[PDB]
């Protein structure tokens, strides 16, 4: 068994989409309001807002995403954006430091940094355990981007209209991922099941983040520190 | 002739209100998104947003402002905020440099800096001429804060309900200013008329800024760079 021409074209475009939207130099970060050690909410608001723009760019290059209706595109992004940021952040995460390292000690985020942005160990503990278990998977970049696309293209999200179309798109991506792992990932007989478990964990992380984000968004002295894009994407408006 | 006890109490509280809300060290500025030389819109958005918070703090300490209804307080601030920022910015303005110097070459703003925030010489020329003519007045701090309070307490602004109350408050402040100048300002026989002319110029500056701000606010790639407070205060929502 091997992968088809169409299956690897999907992988090609998804890999290119991610390289174009994830900048390993992190040099854009000096443009954010600086970190301060809710001391850290300005910096992390800007970080997340910047990351949302990159997730929108990645999404737009997923085969078939741009052909969905504008509402479905919004629906999928409003529900999944925080999950994709959590998944994509694994690339900067270090097992050795148990934190996210983004090219410079100013842009090294530990758990305590995120408590100074208004969050609690009720979210930060499962998040760090998620990152470490995901890092231990040692995913190929191919598998990493496929999982982001699969996560994004979930039809079981609030607001989606074209359930049938989104599922067919996600089905094809899962097919690609299962085949890639069997053929290209030595010893990956259990990998696909683990990755689908991580998608389950993200739903739980999403739920907890939304809960804690409501606290921020309901206190104007904190919500005023957010960005207009963050207010939109994480807000409760429905199209 | 001399000033009454009640007149100088007004001056006392207005001077204290301004010292508490204008920080001559400008050390808070390192918290703004950095300047970049619409390169400068992030930094100037943060600068203006910070300055709005200080104008609200100053307003709250004007005798009688806090006893107005919440709507009138909002109405006066939404219409006058940009004018008070223009007036209060004269304190950092230099005739020698023709620019605003805020403790550090990173926080020195020339006209070209503000064109990189989306504005045109149609606004920036009258603004710089306003600052230089206002600086040439050599106002006492007493006169400076009285003019900010008078500007803020104008009843002829859209949205105000209690015309009669706001005018009485502004009337008392004008009385204080006229008396202060006659008694305490050597050679100020023409000063009060000039200061009231500057209030006229601010209306013209306000008009032009609102026009150019509409361009920013209508293009989402620029409006997303603004702050939630700036969006509120300069926005067109009416209570």
């Amino acid at each position: 068994h091997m992968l088809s021409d169409e299956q690897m074209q999907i992988i090609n475009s998804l890999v290119e989409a991610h390289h174009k939207t994830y900048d390993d130099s992190y040099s854009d970060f000096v443009r954010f309001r600086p970190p301060v050690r809710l001391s850290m909410l300005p910096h992390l608001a800007d970080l997340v807002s910047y990351s949302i723009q990159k997730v929108i760019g990645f999404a737009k290059m997923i085969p078939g995403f741009r052909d969905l209706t504008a509402e479905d595109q919004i629906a999928l992004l409003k529900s999944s954006a925080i999950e994709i940021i959590m998944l994509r952040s694994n690339q900067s995460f270090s097992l050795e430091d148990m934190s996210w390292s983004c090219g410079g000690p100013d842009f090294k985020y530990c758990i305590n940094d995120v408590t100074k942005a208004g969050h609690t160990l009720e979210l930060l503990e499962p998040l760090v355990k998620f990152q470490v278990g995901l890092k231990k998977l040692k995913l190929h970049e191919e598998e990493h981007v496929l999982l982001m696309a699969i996560c994004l293209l979930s039809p079981d999200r609030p607001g989606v209209q074209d359930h049938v179309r989104i599922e067919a798109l996600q089905d094809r991506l899962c097919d690609v991922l299962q085949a890639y792992i069997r053929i290209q990932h030595p010893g990956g007989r259990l990998l696909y099941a683990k990755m689908i478990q991580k998608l389950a964990d993200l739903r739980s992380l999403n739920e907890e983040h939304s809960k804690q984000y409501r606290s921020l968004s309901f206190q104007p002295e904190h919500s005023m520190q957010l960005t207009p894009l963050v207010l939109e994407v994480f807000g409760s408006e429905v199209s | 002739h001399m000033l009454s006890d009640e007149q100088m109490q007004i001056i006392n509280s207005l001077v204290e209100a301004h010292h508490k809300t204008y920080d001559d060290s400008y050390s808070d500025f390192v918290r703004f998104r950095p300047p970049v030389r619409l390169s400068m819109l992030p930094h100037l958005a943060d600068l203006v947003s910070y300055s709005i918070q200080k104008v609200i703090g100053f307003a709250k300490m004007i005798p009688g402002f806090r006893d107005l209804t919440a709507e009138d307080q909002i109405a006066l601030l939404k219409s006058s905020a940009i004018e008070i920022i223009m007036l209060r910015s004269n304190q950092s303005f230099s005739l020698e440099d023709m620019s605003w110097s805020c403790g550090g070459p990173d926080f020195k703003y020339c006209i070209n800096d503000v064109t990189k925030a989306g504005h045109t010489l149609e606004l920036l020329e009258p603004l710089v001429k306003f600052q230089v003519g206002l600086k040439k007045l050599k106002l006492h701090e007493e006169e400076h804060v009285l003019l900010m309070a008078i500007c803020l307490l104008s009843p002829d602004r859209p949205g105000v309900q209690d015309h009669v109350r706001i005018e009485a408050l502004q009337d008392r402040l004008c009385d204080v200013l006229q008396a202060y100048i006659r008694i305490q300002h050597p050679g100020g026989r023409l000063l009060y008329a000039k200061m009231i002319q500057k209030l006229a110029d601010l209306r013209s500056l306000n008009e032009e800024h609102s026009k150019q701000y509409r361009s920013l606010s209508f293009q989402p790639e620029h409006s997303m760079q603004l702050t939630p407070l700036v969006l509120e205060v300069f926005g067109s929502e009416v209570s």
Partner: peptide, 10 residues
């Protein structure tokens, strides 16, 4: 509503 998202989504 969703003014920025619409613009970013082209």
């Amino acid at each position: 509503k969703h003014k920025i998202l619409h613009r970013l989504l082209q």
